[PDB]
Write a protein that binds this ligand. Structure first.
Ligand SMILES: C[As](C)(=O)[O-]
Length: 316
């Protein structure tokens, strides 16, 4: 089942309780939150909803201290484990050692992960609850063609030991992935059917491998980079994907509806490189978030804040 990211940065959003109800109502059994909001945590009790619990980047620093991490796990994890199906903890989101926004935090990620996981195992929850981190693909320097997929040379010192850690505790890697921005930046080279999963024939040829949609190509591009960095056994959970209804080039209702509907359907299966396993995927995001900037980041909602659906999707 597809999951949905619950961002709460709007001035017009439903009460937490109604949002959970709406999740249950729409039969959405998977959620991603970006911080451990207690009301949300208390609201998920007995929901049977598998949860991605996020560590906010501002606390990464704090958690490089083992004791801060311990108390972090006690308050937010052990206090709820009876009734909340914590699935993954996403320690940091879109951290890069070379992106201006997050560079000074990179040092913190792996230690945080060890302390939380260390904290996690002491409570004996390590086979249910996988410690990981959620990346963006700014870290991937090459993805064309997909077989050539490789991480940026200047991010290898950062990613390498993180991969190693993940391999050893058998955790997957989490990736936020937006075919939308790939398309939006280069519609001359990227065809909309390619971006939207509606292409009858392959669009990208990779030796003997043909890519029909932008989403399949990119993940496999990620897979090739993981394989070159000693993560050939890592699973990828896709922790964000979405298409905006307004605010910029190609931000339209129809595109949104197409993209998201094929996607929900697509991930019932895999990619041209790893056909067996289903892609665990989290749709971004449940509500428009009128506080985000710029304009287009306020329209990723799948639902209006009055809780009527934007796109009329089956999540079942
Ligand atoms: C834009 As190209 C030549 O890397 O497919």
């Amino acid at each position: 089942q597809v999951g949905v990211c619950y961002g709460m940065q709007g001035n017009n959003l439903p009460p937490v309780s109604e949002v959970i109800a709406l999740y249950k109502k729409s039969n959405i059994t998977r959620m991603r939150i970006y911080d451990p909001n207690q009301a949300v945590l208390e609201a998920l009790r007995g929901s049977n909803i598998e949860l991605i619990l996020g560590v906010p980047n501002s606390d990464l620093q704090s958690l490089t201290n083992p004791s801060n991490a311990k108390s972090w796990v006690q308050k937010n994890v052990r206090g709820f484990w009876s009734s909340v199906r914590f699935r993954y903890i996403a320690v940091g989101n879109e951290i890069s050692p070379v992106n201006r926004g997050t560079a000074w935090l990179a040092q913190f990620v792996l230690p945080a992960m060890r302390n939380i996981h260390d904290a996690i195992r002491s409570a004996g929850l390590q086979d249910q609850i996988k410690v990981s981190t959620a990346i963006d693909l700014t870290l991937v320097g090459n993805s064309y063609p997909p077989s050539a997929g490789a991480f940026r040379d200047d991010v290898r010192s950062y990613l390498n030991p993180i991969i190693r850690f993940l391999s050893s505790i058998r955790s997957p890697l989490l990736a936020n992935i937006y075919p939308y921005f790939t398309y939006a930046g280069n519609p001359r080279d990227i065809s909309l059917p390619y971006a939207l999963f509606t292409s009858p024939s392959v669009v990208v040829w990779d030796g003997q491998r043909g890519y029909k949609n932008l989403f399949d190509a990119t993940l496999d591009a990620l897979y090739s980079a993981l394989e070159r960095a000693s993560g050939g056994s890592l699973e990828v959970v896709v922790s964000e994907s979405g298409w905006p209804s307004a605010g910029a080039f190609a931000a339209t209702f129809d595109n949104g509806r197409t993209y998201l509907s094929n996607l929900i359907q697509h991930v019932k299966r895999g990619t041209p490189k790893r056909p067996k396993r289903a892609i665990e995927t989290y749709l971004f995001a449940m509500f428009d978030e009128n506080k985000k900037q710029p304009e287009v980041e306020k329209h990723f909602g799948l639902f209006f804040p009055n809780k009527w659906q934007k796109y009329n999707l089956n999540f079942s």
